[PDB]
Design an enzyme around this catalytic site. Structure first.
Site, PDB file in Angstrom:
ATOM      1  N   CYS B  24      34.578  36.861  41.012  1.00  0.00           N
ATOM      2  CA  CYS B  24      33.984  37.838  40.107  1.00  0.00           C
ATOM      3  C   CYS B  24      33.134  37.160  39.043  1.00  0.00           C
ATOM      4  CB  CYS B  24      35.074  38.658  39.413  1.00  0.00           C
ATOM      5  SG  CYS B  24      35.835  39.938  40.431  1.00  0.00           S
ATOM      6  N   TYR B 182      46.324  44.223  43.118  1.00  0.00           N
ATOM      7  CA  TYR B 182      45.441  45.376  43.063  1.00  0.00           C
ATOM      8  C   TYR B 182      45.992  46.482  43.962  1.00  0.00           C
ATOM      9  CZ  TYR B 182      42.499  41.966  40.714  1.00  0.00           C
ATOM     10  OH  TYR B 182      42.046  40.998  39.844  1.00  0.00           O
TER      11      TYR B 182
HETATM   12  C1  LIG Z   1      35.659  33.458  37.924  1.00  0.00           C
HETATM   13  C2  LIG Z   1      36.632  33.604  38.949  1.00  0.00           C
HETATM   14  C3  LIG Z   1      36.453  34.808  39.684  1.00  0.00           C
HETATM   15  C4  LIG Z   1      37.406  35.070  40.809  1.00  0.00           C
HETATM   16  N1  LIG Z   1      37.201  36.255  41.540  1.00  0.00           N
HETATM   17  C5  LIG Z   1      37.984  36.620  42.612  1.00  0.00           C
HETATM   18  C6  LIG Z   1      37.726  37.858  43.375  1.00  0.00           C
HETATM   19  O1  LIG Z   1      36.788  38.580  43.066  1.00  0.00           O
HETATM   20  N2  LIG Z   1      38.606  38.136  44.465  1.00  0.00           N
HETATM   21  C7  LIG Z   1      39.775  37.281  44.904  1.00  0.00           C
HETATM   22  O2  LIG Z   1      40.449  37.561  45.787  1.00  0.00           O
HETATM   23  N3  LIG Z   1      39.976  36.130  44.176  1.00  0.00           N
HETATM   24  C8  LIG Z   1      39.189  35.780  43.115  1.00  0.00           C
HETATM   25  N4  LIG Z   1      39.392  34.569  42.371  1.00  0.00           N
HETATM   26  C9  LIG Z   1      40.458  33.628  42.708  1.00  0.00           C
HETATM   27  C10 LIG Z   1      39.558  32.573  43.641  1.00  0.00           C
HETATM   28  O3  LIG Z   1      39.014  33.181  44.858  1.00  0.00           O
HETATM   29  C11 LIG Z   1      40.310  31.380  44.154  1.00  0.00           C
HETATM   30  O4  LIG Z   1      41.353  31.770  45.077  1.00  0.00           O
HETATM   31  C12 LIG Z   1      40.928  30.610  42.947  1.00  0.00           C
HETATM   32  O5  LIG Z   1      39.934  30.216  41.966  1.00  0.00           O
HETATM   33  C13 LIG Z   1      41.667  29.362  43.401  1.00  0.00           C
HETATM   34  O6  LIG Z   1      40.682  28.331  43.996  1.00  0.00           O
HETATM   35  P1  LIG Z   1      40.042  27.139  43.143  1.00  0.00           P
HETATM   36  O7  LIG Z   1      41.165  26.277  42.597  1.00  0.00           O
HETATM   37  O8  LIG Z   1      39.163  26.409  44.166  1.00  0.00           O
HETATM   38  O9  LIG Z   1      39.223  27.693  42.058  1.00  0.00           O
HETATM   39  C14 LIG Z   1      38.528  34.105  41.157  1.00  0.00           C
HETATM   40  C15 LIG Z   1      38.636  32.864  40.313  1.00  0.00           C
HETATM   41  C16 LIG Z   1      37.813  32.520  39.260  1.00  0.00           C
HETATM   42  C17 LIG Z   1      38.091  31.321  38.626  1.00  0.00           C
HETATM   43  O1  LIG Z   2      41.292  38.989  42.659  1.00  0.00           O
HETATM   44  C1  LIG Z   2      40.894  38.494  41.624  1.00  0.00           C
HETATM   45  C2  LIG Z   2      39.799  39.068  40.733  1.00  0.00           C
HETATM   46  C3  LIG Z   2      39.417  38.441  39.611  1.00  0.00           C
HETATM   47  C4  LIG Z   2      40.054  37.159  39.201  1.00  0.00           C
HETATM   48  C5  LIG Z   2      39.700  36.431  38.027  1.00  0.00           C
HETATM   49  C6  LIG Z   2      40.347  35.231  37.711  1.00  0.00           C
HETATM   50  C7  LIG Z   2      41.374  34.723  38.563  1.00  0.00           C
HETATM   51  C8  LIG Z   2      41.742  35.415  39.722  1.00  0.00           C
HETATM   52  C9  LIG Z   2      41.087  36.633  40.050  1.00  0.00           C
HETATM   53  O2  LIG Z   2      41.504  37.270  41.231  1.00  0.00           O
END
Ligand SMILES: Cc1cc2nc3c(=O)[nH]c(=O)nc-3n(C[C@H](O)[C@H](O)[C@H](O)COP(=O)(O)O)c2cc1C
Ligand SMILES: O=c1ccc2ccccc2o1
Ligand SMILES: Cc1cc2nc3c(=O)[nH]c(=O)nc-3n(C[C@H](O)[C@H](O)[C@H](O)COP(=O)(O)O)c2cc1C
Ligand SMILES: O=c1ccc2ccccc2o1
Ligand SMILES: O=c1ccc2ccccc2o1
Ligand SMILES: O=c1ccc2ccccc2o1
Lengths: 359, 359
Positions: B24, B182
């Site tokens: 997001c 959600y």
């Molecule tokens: C800014 C931001 C927006 C995210 N938006 C979503 C989302 O829209 N849908 C979802 O399932 N997870 C969302 N996540 C969780 C990420 O998809 C991901 O699983 C999480 O950051 C862990 O991976 P990483 O350590 O590589 O960042 C978001 C994380 C961050 C930091």
């Molecule tokens: O599904 C989601 C949507 C937004 C979000 C933002 C930060 C961390 C995890 C998130 O997961």
């Protein structure tokens, strides 16, 4: 850190001392930029850099280096830049542009497509123009056509029109490309300029094209927006002291003529040279030009190592540090630099959608 | 290296095993994405990743998490994605999108603007809907309205319309958001689902909303394009073994129902939990789901360290490695990973305008 201190020149204020120098993308078609450039430039602006200078943009079709070079020789070409300029500003970076004319180095292949002069029977090629009918040599063997006085008048006007268009497109910083062996540099260098008229021979005559072009552009470029130029001050051709003295003298004339900052580089006028490549190797020469011409400067090559950029600024060798290739590798280099130099709230070098999660 | 081996699922082929999970941006207005998303996504696609999954996009206005969330609840909203999808494809990455409904976690502030439920008198807020009228608690105290059977029918149709729109906009990969507390996740969890009708109580009833939504979407989503979902398989709430068994059983039903790959995550259904955060901590659980459900999987959290991504793939814990935050820090992470893992011609992980100069 010095690298993250703002910089004000005329009415423009850069949020830090990081400048992204012009970097050709070779992705334009008939001079028209497209979404490659839009995303590329907008992405870089969001990276945190205080100044983003758009790649060498031709003032005339034959002034392009290659068939993929950007151009601004018509209002339609300028219009293509408007959405990009607006996106750069939205990101908080200052939008600048380098206008140019490749001279005898024009009509060449993209770097990954030969990097050499285009074959005579290639429908994409065109006749090159220069101060004198002498070829660069090496991979650029094409002999250019010696410019007439009317050609000179026309090219100068092309630069004026290009500057006028850049102004109306919203650019807040302009850089005249008088370096790297292209048209401007070739008029100053005795290697390429063998003219016997008002534009060749003496120091004054060889300086004439560059000085007249700067003056002509100054008539349409806003007084409150930085007017700059990139210029090769030495070739590393065994004539460095004599060349550097003349170059510094021209830098003095540029300053007297309204130039606000000079991007110091190497000439690349001829192939037979011995350039001592190295990290921040331009530092000493840039500093000498800055000191002897009493003019703000920037330079590049190897400043992708944050500590080097910081050191150059603290030693007052440069006013702005230009970081090129490191930005192609990582569009968010500014964020990397902030962390490396221990800047407080380094992640906020980037927009909130990124910064919030990296802090 | 395993991380750079292509992956084929249905008719789609990813150039490598790097997936950018939905993230997001909170930059949309009334659900409409704009140039923030265009540049953000196009830039990431050019970075080298094989798959780029667009952020959680609401199937309905009240399904947004915040006032800045993207939406696809109308054809006009879908149209906004077309230029972006086309730009992602032009970069060689596969365009995917996560469609969602925030349920009781909806109507919240952007993370850097409180991250909590919006005040009742705030004109930007709205009523939240969920399986039962029970609040998440903590920073999300708003009690949602218990959905009627017609609400359920309507939301399912919203998912179908969203999938149909994603299809017509050009997306080649879809992910149903059944995780992170959600709507979908909340129907499966006994913490949030206290219903006594066909959608609550038993495992079959709690699974019903998710299974019916998948089946409904399957009717409009192309058979030759990957149909996936993100699902929290455990909460770390002291009920992990019982929850994991039910989740794996649902994963089996998803597979039987046409799901091609499952993005394994944590539930985040309630605040009172003890999640053992750590680099690649999801690896073991993702592997168990992959093995017991015989279904391809991906997961995330801490895989920004190239060697960890490589190790997870070689151990067959994952089929695709999702790297999120590292891409916000460096859009060209794929290039960094290629170098780290010693890939031949690593710079060509990027487009020619960059690769030529970094090799
Ligand atoms: C800014 C931001 C927006 C995210 N938006 C979503 C989302 O829209 N849908 C979802 O399932 N997870 C969302 N996540 C969780 C990420 O998809 C991901 O699983 C999480 O950051 C862990 O991976 P990483 O350590 O590589 O960042 C978001 C994380 C961050 C930091
Ligand atoms: O599904 C989601 C949507 C937004 C979000 C933002 C930060 C961390 C995890 C998130 O997961
Ligand atoms: C792809 C690419 C395009 C470039 N385009 C231009 C240009 O259009 N005008 C110019 O004056 N210099 C140009 N340069 C030279 C750079 O501005 C810069 O001075 C050089 O890369 C040294 O800095 P660096 O070591 O940080 O990359 C280019 C360099 C690369 C690698
Ligand atoms: O750095 C930024 C911050 C906000 C923003 C909004 C629209 C487009 C570009 C932007 O860049
Ligand atoms: O002025 C210029 C224009 C293009 C270019 C390409 C590679 C290296 C240096 C360059 O300088
Ligand atoms: O990776 C790439 C390569 C080429 C290209 C051309 C136009 C737009 C985006 C592109 O991305």
């Amino acid at each position: 850190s010095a690298l993250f201190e703002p910089y004000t020149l005329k009415d423009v204020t850069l949020r830090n001392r990081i400048a992204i120098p012009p970097m050709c993308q070779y992705m334009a078609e008939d001079g028209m930029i497209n979404d490659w450039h839009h995303v590329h430039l907008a992405g870089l602006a969001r990276g945190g850099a205080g100044l983003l200078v758009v790649e060498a943009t031709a003032v005339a079709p034959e002034g392009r280096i290659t068939p993929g070079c950007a151009g601004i020789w018509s209002d339609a070409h300028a219009q293509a830049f408007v959405p990009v300029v607006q996106a750069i500003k939205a990101a908080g970076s200052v939008p600048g542009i380098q206008i140019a004319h490749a001279g005898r180095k024009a009509s060449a292949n993209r770097p990954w497509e030969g990097d050499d002069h285009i074959a005579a029977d290639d429908t994409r090629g065109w006749e090159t123009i220069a101060p004198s009918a002498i070829a660069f040599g090496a991979h650029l063997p094409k002999v250019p056509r010696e410019m007439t006085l009317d050609d000179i008048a026309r090219v100068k006007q092309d630069f004026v029109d290009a500057a006028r268009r850049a102004r109306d497109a919203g650019f807040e910083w302009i850089e005249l490309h008088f370096a790297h062996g292209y048209l401007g540099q070739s008029f100053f260098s005795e290697h390429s300029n063998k003219r016997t008229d008002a534009y060749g021979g003496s120091f004054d005559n060889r300086s004439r094209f560059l000085l007249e072009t700067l003056a002509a552009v100054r008539e349409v470029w806003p007084e409150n927006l930085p007017l700059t130029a990139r210029f090769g001050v030495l070739e590393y051709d065994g004539r460095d002291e004599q060349t550097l003295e003349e170059s510094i003298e021209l830098a003095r004339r540029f300053k007297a003529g309204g130039l606000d900052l000079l991007s110091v580089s190497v000439g690349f006028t001829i192939p037979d040279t011995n350039i001592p490549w190295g990290p921040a190797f331009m530092g000493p020469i840039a500093e000498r030009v800055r000191r002897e011409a009493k003019l703000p400067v920037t330079s590049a090559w190897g400043f992708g190592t944050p500590q080097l950029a910081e050191a150059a600024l603290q030693a007052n060798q440069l006013d702005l540090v230009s970081v090129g290739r490191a930005h192609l590798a990582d569009p968010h280099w500014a964020y990397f630099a902030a962390k490396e130099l221990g800047v407080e709230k380094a992640s906020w070098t980037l927009p909130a959608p990124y910064a919030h999660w990296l802090e």
